[PDB]
Each structure stands twice: as C-alpha cells, then as structure tokens.
Amino acid sequence: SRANDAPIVLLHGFTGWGREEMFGFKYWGGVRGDIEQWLNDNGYRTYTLAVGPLSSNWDRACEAYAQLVGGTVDYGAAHAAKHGHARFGRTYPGLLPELKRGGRIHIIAHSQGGQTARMLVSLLENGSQEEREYAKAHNVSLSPLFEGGHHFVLSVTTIATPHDGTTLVNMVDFTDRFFDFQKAVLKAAAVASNVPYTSQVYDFKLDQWGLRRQPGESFDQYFERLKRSPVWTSTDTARYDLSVPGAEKLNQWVKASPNTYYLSFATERTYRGALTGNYYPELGMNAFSAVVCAPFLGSYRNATLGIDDRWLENDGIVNAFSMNGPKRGSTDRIVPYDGTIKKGVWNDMGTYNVDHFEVIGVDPNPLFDIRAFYLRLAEQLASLQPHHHHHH
Ligand SMILES: [Ca+2]
Ligand SMILES: [Zn+2]
Secondary structure, eight states: OOOOOOOEEEEOOSSOOOTTSGGGOOTTTGGGOOHHHHHHHTTOOEEEEOOOTTBOHHHHHHHHHHHHHOEEEEOOHHHHHHHTSOSEEEEEOOSOTTGGGTOOEEEEEETTHHHHHHHHHHHHHHOOHHHHHHHHHTTOOOOGGGTOOOOOEEEEEEESOOTTOOTTTTSTTHHHHHHHHHHHHHHHTTOOSSOOOSSOOSOOOBTTTTBOOOTTOOHHHHHHHHHTSHHHHSSSBHHHHHSHHHHHHHHHHOOOOTTSEEEEEEEOOEEEOTTTOOEEEOTTOOHHIIIIIHHHHTTOOBTTTTBOGGGOOBSSSSBGGGTSOOOTTOOOOEEEOOSOOOBSSEEEEEEESOOTTTTTTSSOOTTSOHHHHHHHHHHHHHTOOSSOOOOO
16 A cells, blocks of 8 residues: 655745744645645645745755755855855754655645755755855855755655746736735735735745835735845746746756656646637636636747747646646656656646646635545555566
8 A cells, every 4th residue: 555654745836835824824725724734634744845935946945955954044155146145044943854864755846836846856866066166166165955965855746837837927017917926815815915914924035135024014015125126036036937938947957856756737727719729717717817817828829939829728827738847948758647656757647627726725616626636646655666676
C-alpha cells in the first residue's frame, strides 16, 4: 500500500498566506475547509509554507528553504547585488528539522507555486554556480542552498501552474487587473480592501524590499504603492516569472531532477465557441475571472510570441496548455500518465474541470469533491517508491 513516510508540504502562487493570516481562512481549503487538516486527520503528515506572493520564484525559493530547515533567509550575495534588495530576509524556526538529517518531503504546489517548487529542487540539487563564484570572488559567506548536494524532495506535484507562463499579463491593464486578484482573495475571506486594519491580515513578506503596509493604509492604498515599487517594476518579481518570456527564461535553467518525481495537474473552466474558435468562461467561474481575464485568455493570440489556438483553453487565470509542464525553453520530458509514476519525468495527470480558485477551495464548487481529490493525491504520493528496481 504505502511505500514512504515523507510528509507533505503545501505551496501557494501569486496569492497566498499563512494558516494564521486572513482571520482563519485558509488558502488551502478556503470556503471548503482546511486541506492541511484533512490530510493530517487521515494520517498524512502535512505542513504549509507561506512565501512572498509577489516575489520572484528565486526569493520564494530562498524563503522556502529557510522556512523548512530553519534560519535566516539568505537570497544570495550576487543575487542581491544584481537586483538591489537586501541579502538577508526573515528568520524562521524550521518546519522540518528532519530534512538536515536525511529526511524527504512531497511538495504539493498550486499556481506559481509550481515554478517555485521546481526552482527550489534545482537549487537544492545543483546550487548556483554564479553564487558560488561570487562568494570566492568577493569573499562573502555562502548559503548551503547554493552549494548543491541536497536531496530533500521525493516529489513535486503541480496544480494549475504556469510552467510556460500565462498570457493574462499581456493585458494592457494587467497591473490594475492583477491587484484585483488580491482584493478578491481578500473578499473571499471577508476582508475589505478600503479599510486600514491595524492587524496585519495579509503579509506580503517583502522584507527584502523594505515594503510593508503602514498605519492608516487600506489594502487599496497599499496596492497603489506596490505597483510603483520594485516588486512590480523589476525583473526580480512574480510578474516577470509569470510572463511567457519570463517562464521561458526560468525554464532554461530549472530542470527536472532525475531523483525526483513530478506530477502535473491541469485545470479548465471553459467552452469553445464554434464560430470564433475562442474559449469562453463556464457557468460557476468566479466573477473576477469570468468578467475580465477569462475572455482575454480565450481570445488572445500572438503569432510572434508563439501564441496560437492551443493556448486559449483556460482556468480563468492561466492557460491550460502551460500547466502540463515546462515546454518553452525546457529540456524536461513530459509523459502522459499510464498507471505508472515514472521518476525524473513530468507525469501528466490530465485536465480537470475546475477553475483556478475552485481547485483550492477559495471559490466554491460543489460539483467538485475537493476532499477526495487531495486524499487521492496523498495516497498516490505515499505509494511512491524511494528507489525503484528496473524490471520486465
Ligand atoms: Ca464557482
Ligand atoms: Zn530577489
């Protein structure tokens, strides 16, 4: 039945928060409950990571590592010099100090979470040649995360991840539209955007950039400030990594480890129009996605960028064609699931009829058994064999 005892770790996208944030409301579960809890009750040790939702995958990856092993976030000296932010972040206690002693984990990531998870794997296993070269060139200390040689991750599961980016950013008004997604998760959780709460509520963890919501500042007001900040204007952001070109770049160095299993899940909440060839939002898609983005994703074409008709289908925020695994600028192989979970290859699990937010329970969908979906997932992860024997 079960082949391993690795704990499961949860990871979010451009939206996300800690278990104690959003007054109880969990990113993993939302209006449908508590995912991390359900899995623990069913006997699968499960934890949750909270990283900078608008930060680049690199920053998140450094935060994920430190949050898992414990310590102060070290973004890398060369990295910090190149982007002009702090080298050191926040300090963590360490969710799983067992990792530094031979332990392994299973990473279930959603949205942009999937790129982060890939990146963390590639850094753990290979480190950063540039970071290593800069350490000795300028005699600065070096994070273990940049030496290579770690083997913490048994598997990586991706759900609605923009492996090849999303064409949602190509919107002319993407800046304003995008912060409406943060406003939306705030409403999902019953939190207003026009109110200066004195309690944090939603920490964007921008310690490296020196940004934070201040006194008598409503999320709306704070979002206006962010838009003009490096978090939204520099390449070292989630906005860059989310774009087609940015993903392509990330795809060029972030490869699938041969020692790690990879699982892909794709989402889709659309229908094809017979005369236009466009995709249109289905009944039950969240109102923010259905009004502005869903129509853009299913009609947006760009020949020079490589955007044709296979990119139309979407989950209201991310193109479905970009979820089965990195393709643009990648050497990673993808194989359709045939009952056998191979290692070092993207095991394409197919497309599911749920939106970007229905998969995590942030948006409701009673036609979707979210409990069964994540219980099936973990049962599958526990059955993964650490070392598989070659056979007939
Ligand atoms: Ca819905
Ligand atoms: Zn950075």
